[PDB]
Design a binder for this molecule. Structure first.
Ligand SMILES: CCCCCCCC/C=C\CCCCCCCC(=O)OC[C@H](COP(=O)(O)OCC[N+](C)(C)C)OC(=O)CCCCCCC/C=C/CCCCCCCC
Ligand SMILES: Cc1nc(Nc2ccc(F)cc2)nc(N2CCc3ccccc3[C@H]2C)c1C
Ligand SMILES: *[C@@H]1O[C@H](CO)[C@@H](O)[C@H](O)[C@H]1NC(C)=O
Ligand SMILES: *[C@@H]1O[C@H](CO)[C@@H](O)[C@H](O)[C@H]1NC(C)=O
Ligand SMILES: *[C@@H]1O[C@H](CO)[C@@H](O)[C@H](O)[C@H]1NC(C)=O
Ligand SMILES: [Mg+2]
Ligand code: NA
Lengths: 984, 261
């Protein structure tokens, strides 16, 4: 703050530098050594293996790692007793490890590809600078700048350091990145403001001198720059866990609790039966492992990748898989204005002529409503602003869209030339034809631009005088005016209307520019005579006014409808900007952040002509908060103000204040999305649950801090993102239910085997084939399901009450569908045993004799005697038949998981072609696993008879019918006990 | 807890009813299964494509059958002798009263139940048909002189026919070293060591509750002493196959023998 306030003399003694001579070369070198390079320090402490390790870590990943460790410890215990058939422990352990590793590799590949796609926009620049040393002006590198160096500035420079201007003549710079100000700001030595940002005598690091020349001293370098301190603040921000990760952690907690309960109860059962304590411990570990799915993580990752691919089809690049859901659960969108909700380019917005305010089209693609252009007054005004303008187009562009086409000159000149090229077709060629015999540019005294032009018509060479300037200076120079296409004298009513129009157009934040013309006849001025600028032979008064043209940075074409759709989705939209409150409020009204009929306390005070003390705050729905007012506030008042006003706009907010707003919104218990394009948004972007950075208009810091990037700079991609997030939430919970339901069928045979001592119904290899091969595809195909209701009308989900997996889902999947599948499998198992010679009663307690290698003549129910190998082949037959029962039940299970509430007849059985292909694939893989030569040797699968394929089919139909009746009952009685308890 | 008492009891009753309905469905399915199966003949003999072969006495060593004993010390073969007496107790005339004399010398087919309590006739086998290795007059079963007797028993399968061409025979021989040394000499009881054809087919426990497996005792006469040998005994029949690597006991039995001197 002392950098700008101090005057020349004390700065000389403070920095040991001369305002003219400059810093000494030896002093400059020693100060460069002491302070260091001017370049901002880039953090580079992100190794590749660290990222891979992070991708290998997470809730489901830690659960699977602990399951593998438990398998290894149980195998160690079994080896301590010298037991047999322990290779299944390794099979399960390596299965879990391989799944975790492949999933981590896939996620790392996705992140690496996204980073490479984003990195194409980076572009280094040497950024040379002009400095005075030893009295000889020359050039150095950007980092070579040292504090106190006397440095020159000219149009098109990048301002390689923070510099206090000591001399300036019409210098205009843009601070749309560091600050939120879209309009170019003047840099002048004169200083009155306390804030370094608003102060006019200082320049900033990541800026650009649009026009003018200047010279000043270097106040800060390196990471002490404003951009440097912003980057340091962003580095201080710490990322938090994404909502989907929290849901996964809650689900893993549920799984672990249920596993511990079942393991403990059956361990006590194993004590009660008479098993050895070590055997009961091994059974405990087996149950705990059996409650841990390993193919679930792969399906979750595949669903996330599919949603990310759908988003990337629409130029939405997510840097991580978990970010594709966050927008779906977002409750608050904090939006930057300049460059995010607006185009960041000045353009013509309104035209006041003929006592009428017409609105021009401001969309970058020219897809908006046009104004009336069948007036000769419009033709006169068009000639006026066409001939006055001096900006020129960049060469080589004829197929480039006009709004994006490159123009050289002032921002106002660029906007006027673009407006002419839109209304006209070839104003660039139109300007050349008219000769500029007299041309007077903008002057500190004249405060206007003047041009004398000769007419195109050979018959009429009458001179035309066109002037462009500030309305408060232009109006006093006029006597007549174009009205209805005629010349009319100025009365008091016309001046009153001019003042009202000027005040109204200035109340929208749009700069108002006045235009006028006059006709010089050949009697007054001969055609061959040349006009002289210094002679001032012109009347310079009594002019004929044309109209007013007001220019403002406009919203992007798709912004208003996207904002409206987000509001109908229950997401509250807050605008935060570093711009002036007038422009912020006008933009918020334009884009629908402030709804029509919603007025602020200032508007109410103006309406009732009452001081704000008696004005009731609750009457006003909209609210605009300045940065100073925010600083005066305290967190309790800020929370109360957030709750009180549904529509709220923050203007003149520093990066720290945006960070605090995001922190308050998050601390209130809401999921916050932050949209940004500039470095001033990077701290809040990193603090947000999801940060969305503009791609074309975004800066490096904003893209780095953000989770998502919009490559086409389409704000409408946010509504697609939130729709996809809600859809992936619903489809993910459906897929999780489908995957979970088959745990109980795989585990129940082990419980029965341990307790009742029947021969083992299901083996570990069959369980691996179920988990890893057959059922991955149908659960993934469940992610292509369409929404049952309309996604947009619904409110954002409550993060606390609405969970991804809750008790109703787990209870239903585990203990109703899983119970039915277990019963089907056991029915088919007993059918297979009885039809081969082993009645159900004989199977009870037969395990010790069944597994005894010394018994080669065990008798069945018919008295036939079996060897160990034949009994083992019967066991493999049981494995196969129970596996087929599970698969047949899962075919109906995926169909019931298609919808949570709607009937399967209401939706389509065949509308999801991927689901049909998945079911066909599952049937084919099962058939191949059964009837392939040599199968019983490698994988314990046997060619079974067709009768055992049909035994579980009634149970599949039972699952379908039961789920359909449940959903019908839920639909019929929305608020009943059945809906409350039986809906998941 | 998270639910009121009424809600908890309502959901508990609902789950109890659901599980009762599922249990009833499962019980009905198992009852229908039990009602369809035949009590006399297996429906789908699939892993019983060839009978297994077992040996008495059976001591299984580490992994497979391994018989060893000290000829000087009687305690070593005392257990094997007890095993042989215990097995042959079942094939005693007191335990063969239900069965009847049987000299048909061919497949003793039975299409009807003409035996007491609606059963079928079973042809009797008595231990005395083993003669020398029956336990009389040698209770040691030849173990005392280093000439052990081993009983080979073929597993019974319902309605399984070994072959009409010749009664199934048993053939014992060295495996590791057949060519080396003199060939193994074995004396069989009954003559030629054949299973008589009137013991087949088996009709099941229900049809033939007193059915008794035919026995063949093989006595080894020339076994080197203090040397480990491997002896394989196969069943020669038309429909009995012994080429199954994944089941070493199918159609044959292999055992290690070591007669220490
Ligand atoms: C949370 C609550 C869990 C509840 C679990 C239990 C559910 C109900 C299951 C069993 C309880 C009842 C036990 C009997 C069930 C079958 C009833 C039945 O009708 O049996 C009939 C047979 C006897 O034949 P018979 O007298 O008719 O023949 C007559 C003809 N003659 C005499 C000539 C042979 O008796 C038999 O075989 C009995 C065979 C029993 C086999 C052991 C049990 C195997 C069952 C596994 C299902 C597990 C489901 C788990 C659910 C999910 C949990 C998360
Ligand atoms: C035959 C057998 N053996 C074991 N052994 C073992 C494993 C782990 C442990 F900690 C101790 C012992 N586990 C078995 N199940 C129980 C059934 C099941 C279901 C789904 C996933 C895995 C399993 C494993 C876990 C089975 C079927
Ligand atoms: C077997 O036992 C007898 C009993 O004393 C002993 O003399 C003989 O040496 C043993 N056999 C061998 C090979 O040691
Ligand atoms: C059955 O066996 C003998 C010899 O075949 C036969 O003559 C006699 O009738 C029966 N004897 C006994 C003891 O059953
Ligand atoms: C079996 O016993 C008979 C006496 O009944 C005897 O003549 C014969 O030599 C014995 N054979 C063998 C191999 O011991
Ligand atoms: Mg911005
Ligand atoms: Na983040």
């Amino acid at each position: 703050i002392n950098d700008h306030q101090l005057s020349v003399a004390e700065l000389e003694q403070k920095y040991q530098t001369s305002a003219t001579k400059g810093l000494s070369a030896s002093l400059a070198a020693e100060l460069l050594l002491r302070d260091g390079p001017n370049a901002l320090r880039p953090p580079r402490g992100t190794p590749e293996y660290v990222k891979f390790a992070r991708q290998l870590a997470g809730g489901l990943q830690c659960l699977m790692w602990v399951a593998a460790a438990i398998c290894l410890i149980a195998f160690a215990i079994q080896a301590s007793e010298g037991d047999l058939t322990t290779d299944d422990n390794l099979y399960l352990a390596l299965a879990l490890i391989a799944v975790v590793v492949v999933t981590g590799c896939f996620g790392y590949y996705q992140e690496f590809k996204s980073t490479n796609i984003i990195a194409s926009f980076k572009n280094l620049v040497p950024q040379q600078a002009t400095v005075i040393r030893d009295g000889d002006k020359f050039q150095i590198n950007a980092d070579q700048l040292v504090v106190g160096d006397l440095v020159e500035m000219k149009g098109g420079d990048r301002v390689p350091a923070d510099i206090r201007i000591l001399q300036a003549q019409g210098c205009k710079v843009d601070n749309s990145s560091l600050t939120g100000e879209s309009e170019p700001q003047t840099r002048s030595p004169e200083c009155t403001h306390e804030s370094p940002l608003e102060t006019r005598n200082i320049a900033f690091f990541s800026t650009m001198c649009l026009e003018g020349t200047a010279q000043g001293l270097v106040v800060n370098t390196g990471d002490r720059t404003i951009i440097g301190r912003i980057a340091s603040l962003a580095s201080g921000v710490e990322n938090e866990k994404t909502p989907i990760a929290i849901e996964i952690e809650h689900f893993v907690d549920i799984i672990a609790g249920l596993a511990i309960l079942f393991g403990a109860t059956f361990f006590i059962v194993a004590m009660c039966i008479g098993y050895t304590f070590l055997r009961a411990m091994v059974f405990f570990m087996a149950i705990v492992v059996a409650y841990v799915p390993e193919g679930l993580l792969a399906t979750v990752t595949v669903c996330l990748s599919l949603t990310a691919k759908r988003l990337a089809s629409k130029n939405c690049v997510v840097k991580n898989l978990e970010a594709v859901e966050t927008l779906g659960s977002t409750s608050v969108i904090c939006s930057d204005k300049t460059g995010t909700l607006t185009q960041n380019r000045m353009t013509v917005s309104h035209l006041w002529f003929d006592n009428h305010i017409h609105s021009a089209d401001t969309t970058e693609d020219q897809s908006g409503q046009t104004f009336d252009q069948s007036s000769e007054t419009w033709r006169a005004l068009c000639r006026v602003l066409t001939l006055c303008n001096r900006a020129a187009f960049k060469s080589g562009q004829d197929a480039v869209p006009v709004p994006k086409r490159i123009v050289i000159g002032d921002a106002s000149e660029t906007a006027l030339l673009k407006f002419s090229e839109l209304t006209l077709g070839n104003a660039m060629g139109y300007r050349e034809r008219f000769p500029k015999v007299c041309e007077i540019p903008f002057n500190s005294t004249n405060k206007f631009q003047l041009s004398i032009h000769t007419l195109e018509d050979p018959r009429d060479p009458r001179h035309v005088l066109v002037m462009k300037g500030a309305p408060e200076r232009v109006l006093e120079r006029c006597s007549s005016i174009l009205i209805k296409g005629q010349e009319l004298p100025l009365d008091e009513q016309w001046r009153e209307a001019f003042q009202t129009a000027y005040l109204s157009l200035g109340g929208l934040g749009e700069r108002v520019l006045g235009f006028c013309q006059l006709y010089l006849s050949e009697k007054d001025y001969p055609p061959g005579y040349a006009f002289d600028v210094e002679a001032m032979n012109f009347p310079t008064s009594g002019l004929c006014f044309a109209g007013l043209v007001s220019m403002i940075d406009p919203p992007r074409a798709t912004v208003p409808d996207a904002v409206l759709k987000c509001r109908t989705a229950g997401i509250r939209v807050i605008m935060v900007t570093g711009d002036h409150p007038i422009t912020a409020k006008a933009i918020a009204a334009s884009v629908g952040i402030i709804s029509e009929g919603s007025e602020t306390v200032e508007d109410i005070a103006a309406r009732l002509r009452v001081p704000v003390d008696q004005v009731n705050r609750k009457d006003a729905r909209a609210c605009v908060i300045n940065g100073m007012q925010l600083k005066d506030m305290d967190p309790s008042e800020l929370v109360e103000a957030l709750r009180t006003h549904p529509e709220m706009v923050f203007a003149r907010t520093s990066p720290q204040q945006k960070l605090v707003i995001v922190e308050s919104c998050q601390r209130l218990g809401a999921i916050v999305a932050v949209t940004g394009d500039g470095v001033n948004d990077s701290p809040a972007l990193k603090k947000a649950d999801i940060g969305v950075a503009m791609g074309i208009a975004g800066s490096d810091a904003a893209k780095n801090a953000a989770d998502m990037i919009l490559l086409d700079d389409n704000f409408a991609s946010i509504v697609t993102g939130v729709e996809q997030g809600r859809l992936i939430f619903d489809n993910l919970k459906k897929s999780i239910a489908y995957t979970l339901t088959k745990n109980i069928p795989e585990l129940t045979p082990y419980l029965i085997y341990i307790t009742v001592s029947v021969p083992l119904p299901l083996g570990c290899i069959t369980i691996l084939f179920i988990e890893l091969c057959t059922d991955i595809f149908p659960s993934v195909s469940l992610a292509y399901e369409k929404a049952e209701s309309d996604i947009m009308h619904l409110r954002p989900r409550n993060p606390k009450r609405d969970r991804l997996v809750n008790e109703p889902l787990a209870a239903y999947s585990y203990f109703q569908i899983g119970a039915i599948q277990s019963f089907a499998g056991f029915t088919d198992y007993f059918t297979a045993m009885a039809q081969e010679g082993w009645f159900p009663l004989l199977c009870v307690g037969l395990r010790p004799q069944w597994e005894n290698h010394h018994l080669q003549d065990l008798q069945d129910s018919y008295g036939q005697e079996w060897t160990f190998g034949q009994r083992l082949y019967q066991q493999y037959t049981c494995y196969t038949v129970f596996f087929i029962s599970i698969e047949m039940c899962q075919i109906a299970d995926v169909l019931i998981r298609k919808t949570r509430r709607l009937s399967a007849f209401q939706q389509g059985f065949f509308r999801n072609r991927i689901l049909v292909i998945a079911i066909v694939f599952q049937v084919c893989i099962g058939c191949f696993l059964c009837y392939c030569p040599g199968m019983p040797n490698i994988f314990n699968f046997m060619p079974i008879r067709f009768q055992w394929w049909l035994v579980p089919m009634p149970f599949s139909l039972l699952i379908f019918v039961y789920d359909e009746i449940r959903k019908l009952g839920v639909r019929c009685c929305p608020g009943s006990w059945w809906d409350q308890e039986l809906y998941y | 807890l998270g639910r009121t008492l009424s809600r908890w009891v309502w959901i508990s009753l609902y789950y109890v009813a659901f599980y009762v309905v599922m249990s009833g469905i499962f019980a009905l399915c198992i009852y229908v299964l039990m009602r369809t199966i035949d009590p006399y003949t297996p429906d789908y003999q699939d892993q019983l494509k060839s009978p297994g072969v077992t040996l008495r006495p059976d001591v299984y060593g580490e992994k497979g059958l391994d018989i060893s004993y000290n000829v000087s010390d009687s305690t070593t073969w005392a257990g094997l002798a007890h095993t042989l007496h215990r097995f042959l107790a079942g094939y005693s005339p007191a335990a063969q009263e239900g069965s009847i004399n049987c000299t048909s010398e061919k497949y003793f087919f039975q299409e009807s139940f003409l035996a007491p309590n609606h059963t079928k006739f079973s042809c009797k086998f008595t231990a005395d048909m083993l003669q020398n290795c029956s336990g009389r007059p040698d209770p040691t079963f030849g173990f005392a002189e280093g000439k052990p007797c081993f009983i080979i028993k073929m597993n019974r399968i319902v309605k399984f026919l070994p072959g009409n061409s010749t009664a199934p025979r048993v053939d014992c021989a060295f495996l590791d070293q057949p060519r080396d040394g003199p060939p193994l000499q074995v004396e069989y009881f009954p003559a030629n060591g054949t299973y008589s054809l009137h013991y087949f087919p088996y009709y099941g426990k229900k049809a033939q509750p007193h059915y008794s497996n035919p026995l063949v005792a093989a006595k080894l006469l020339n076994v080197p002493r203090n040397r480990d040998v491997v002896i394989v005994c196969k069943i020669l029949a038309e429909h009995v196959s012994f080429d199954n690597p994944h089941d070493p006991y199918e159609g044959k039995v292999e055992f290690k023998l070591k007669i220490q001197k």
